[PDB]
Amino acid sequence: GPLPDAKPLVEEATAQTKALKSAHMVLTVNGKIPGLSLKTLSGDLTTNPTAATGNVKLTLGGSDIDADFVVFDGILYATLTPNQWSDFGPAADIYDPAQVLNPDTGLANVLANFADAKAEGRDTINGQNTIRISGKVSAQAVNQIAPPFNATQPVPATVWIQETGDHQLAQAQLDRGSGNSVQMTLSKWGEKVQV
Ligand SMILES: CCCCCCCCCCCCCCC[C@@H](O)O[C@H](CO[C@H](O)CCCCCCCC[C@@H](C)CCCCCCCC)COP(=O)(O)O[C@H]1[C@H](O[C@@H]2O[C@@H](CO)[C@H](O)[C@H](O)[C@@H]2O)[C@H](O)[C@H](O)[C@@H](O)[C@@H]1O[C@H]1O[C@@H](CO[C@@H](O)CCCCCCCCCCCCCCC)[C@@H](O)[C@H](O)[C@@H]1O
Hints:
Distance between the termini: 43 Å
Number of domains: 1
Number of strands: 11
Radius of gyration: 17 Å
Strand content: over 45%
Largest sheet: 11 strands, antiparallel
Bound molecules: ligand Z69
Number of helices: 3
Helix content: 10-25%
């Protein structure tokens, strides 16, 4: 029918996101973003304490490698060859995955700096009704969650927020122009993450 007002949905999702401890995430890079060699990633993240497990497809020296990865006790491990775990040192020297759910600099900060929010339509995400919402994310909030963006201006964005229930952030995408973008889909909020 009619669409709810986006502004209160965004505010509710902001609050809900700040309280998150854990989630499943699927990250897709569309086109090309300089200094971001990642193509796709799917995994499970928990925080306080930080742990993550999953799989990643990335480009290394011009070859796409499929790898499994684990972040535990501050350290990043990954199978660059199958069943062979390599230790790549402190995760934070590459990207501390806890950043995504940091209430100050993660997804909640993106939501809190999401300007001009406007409800655009309704979409199913992972079996759930969500409201698709356009807006622009501040350069600072974008650079904090995704440094390679190197934004010097507000970044056009789309968020999908659950229409009912908890109003979680279901999906978000940041458009760098020219068919290049990064999108994350969140689900399984509060799941246990063993690792
Ligand atoms: C959703 C679930 C939660 C997760 C969220 C998603 C996060 C995904 C992150 C994926 C990025 C993996 C790509 C690794 C590329 C690799 O080249 O990184 C650089 C080189 O590192 C070495 O080369 C490592 C060995 C080579 C290959 C890597 C091994 C394989 C491991 C991995 C790829 C497999 C699994 C990966 C998946 C893990 C997911 C984790 C959960 C970093 O080197 P340094 O450690 O020296 O770091 C930098 C240094 O900074 C450090 O910080 C200092 C602070 O003071 C310290 O003192 C420290 O000493 C050091 O100085 C330097 O300054 C230097 O200037 C800079 O150039 C250095 O490297 C930089 O060099 C380039 C490399 O670029 C490409 O190679 C790719 C870089 C990708 C990094 C971007 C992170 C992803 C963005 C997150 C998106 C989130 C989306 C949110 C939703 C919208 C830059 O792009 C980038 O800035 C990079 O960091």
